[PDB]
Amino acid sequence: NSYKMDYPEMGLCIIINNKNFHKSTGMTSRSGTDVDAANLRETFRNLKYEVRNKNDLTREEIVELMRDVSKEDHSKRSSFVCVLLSHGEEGIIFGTNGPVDLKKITNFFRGDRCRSLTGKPKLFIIQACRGTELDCGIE
Amino acid sequence: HKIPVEADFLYAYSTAPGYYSWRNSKDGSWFIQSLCAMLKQYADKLEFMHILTRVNRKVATEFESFSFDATFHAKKQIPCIVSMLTKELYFY
């Protein structure tokens, strides 16, 4: 079987684009991430998603945003897409001012906390590090 | 009649667990480049997991790191599809 994708709307597309970080984090500016955020915006626009671009959100703003989005009424939306573009660690995404647990972000949209998305695909696209290991590859 | 609260989630990671993720300062990140490319090309032909599978092969075969720092040079990257979905996903 296949997910029902013929609701009135396809759903939201939340793009969180963190490029510049507070000096306390020691994180470098993520040059090139704007190209990503714009390409994502066009790609998912063409997929008929309601794209919402957010730039340089703090750790608190990310949480409050995801909370606000999860408390929206997704009843006539087919799905939900969240894209995270920032620095990271295993299970961790960085707001401009510090780290955020990925679990904390995603838990807002669990089947029991976001009823209007229950039974609908919840896609989280994460562009961030997951540690400091390097793949040297093989030919 | 219940379903798990963790069901119907898909986590498309740019890189494998524990690994660095790579980004080109002018072209953008390898993963997002490939994801948008494959979506643009296949969203009306393929199921989402198969699209992401092609995203994996693109990142794996077409990218290799260039760095002045020898520690970070000539490195590779494989994306990581984590699916708790219960159905197939089509964008049409």
């Binding site: 620095h87 562009q127 590090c129 | 790579w22 980004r23 990140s29 790191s65 760095s67």
Partner: peptide
Amino acid sequence: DEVX
């Protein structure tokens, strides 16, 4: 090429 940079890392995240």
